[PDB]
Amino acid sequence: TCPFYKKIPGTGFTVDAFQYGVVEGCTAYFLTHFHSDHYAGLSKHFTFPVYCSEITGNLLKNKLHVQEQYIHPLPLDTECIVNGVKVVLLDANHCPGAVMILFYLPNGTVILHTGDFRADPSMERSLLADQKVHMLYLDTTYCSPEYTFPSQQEVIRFAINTAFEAVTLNPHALVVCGTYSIGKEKVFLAIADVLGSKVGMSQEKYKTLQCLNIPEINSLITTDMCSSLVHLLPMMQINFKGLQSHLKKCGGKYNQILAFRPTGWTHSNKFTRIADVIPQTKGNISIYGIPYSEHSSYLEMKRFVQWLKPQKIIPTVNVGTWKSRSTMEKYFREWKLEAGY
Ligand code: NI
């Protein structure tokens, strides 16, 4: 049955709630982004209205075959009316097409649902600046002070410099990047751009990327693996066995692999700077784990919430254990006492 933290009070609405069958009292189903833990349950047999971004709607139609008459895309940063309730979609700084949703309830309550997000000070100048928010449905993925990670820009600098050095030293090295969902496209696009190459990938992944409105995409990606020296593979194949096998398939065009696994957080962050990251190596294969996150760090999350000053916080992540829930509630109280709201 649908959990309370996926239901928006005073409305007929649910958020990211497609795996529970027909939810009692639900007149419109919102989808924040196209990640499987959020879309789980949608298919061509769904016949209720789905409200989402343009990009998420492309993916619903093309990848899951949802029929067009039930997809309701909304423009961002624009006041819209849904079943008699004013809503606004905001950029979540997550993966392509990911949104936060502002609901203006008929009784005067304003609710922000962040979906999955990476808080940024640029959000402090969107339509959020213009009114008070009473209730916040918050992505608490990394809500503990041990979770620090560098900016996305530092991590991409590291990747570009590492790849450019390796290929200039050995023009017969292949770069491989792991993927299992949309998001983190900058990793493989930035590397291909510095090397003067397209990114090669499976037909299924190319289709997925063609749904994303990324400018000049036909210029950066391809299904012709032979012409590319940056290859995308499933995240599960980014290990010594999987990579040795791939290299066999390239027919002696290459004699070395440099591979990237963009993880979120790994405890190497508590001790080590990005500058100091080193690979695991076996023979002619090296594997770098890079801390490229599309979720808030602890400090980013804290700054957002202390700026917004909500009256009530509803966590949406790590809510299944009493120890996690108690930990989060203690941080929310600290934040409120330190800031004075
Ligand atoms: Ni997500």
Curated annotation (Swiss-Prot):
Variant or mutagenesis effect after changing residue 139 to N: Impaired nuclear focus formation, reduced interaction with PIAS and increased sensitivity to cisplatin
Keywords tagged on the record: Cell cycle, Cell division, DNA damage, DNA repair, Hydrolase, Isopeptide bond, Metal-binding, Mitosis, Nucleus, Phosphoprotein, Ubl conjugation, Zinc, Zinc-finger
Gene Ontology CC: fibrillar center; nucleoplasm
Induction remarks: During mitosis. The mRNA encoding this protein contains an internal ribosome entry site (IRES) in its 5'-UTR. This 5'-UTR generally suppresses translation while specifically promoting expression during mitosis, when cap-dependent translation may be impaired.
Family statement: Belongs to the DNA repair metallo-beta-lactamase (DRMBL) family.
Function: May be required for DNA interstrand cross-link repair. Also required for checkpoint mediated cell cycle arrest in early prophase in response to mitotic spindle poisons. Possesses beta-lactamase activity, catalyzing the hydrolysis of penicillin G and nitrocefin. Exhibits no activity towards other beta-lactam antibiotic classes including cephalosporins (cefotaxime) and carbapenems (imipenem).
Expression across tissues: Expressed in brain, heart, kidney, liver, pancreas, placenta and skeletal muscle.
Gene Ontology molecular function: any one: damaged DNA binding
Location in the cell: Nucleus
Source organism (scientific name): Homo sapiens (Human)
Complexes and interactors: Binds constitutively to TP53BP1. Binds CDC27, which is itself a component of the anaphase promoting complex (APC). Binds PIAS1.
Name of the molecule in the record: DNA cross-link repair 1A protein
GO terms for biological process, alphabetical: cell division; double-strand break repair via nonhomologous end joining; interstrand cross-link repair
Principal subcellular localization: nucleus
Coiled coil spans: none
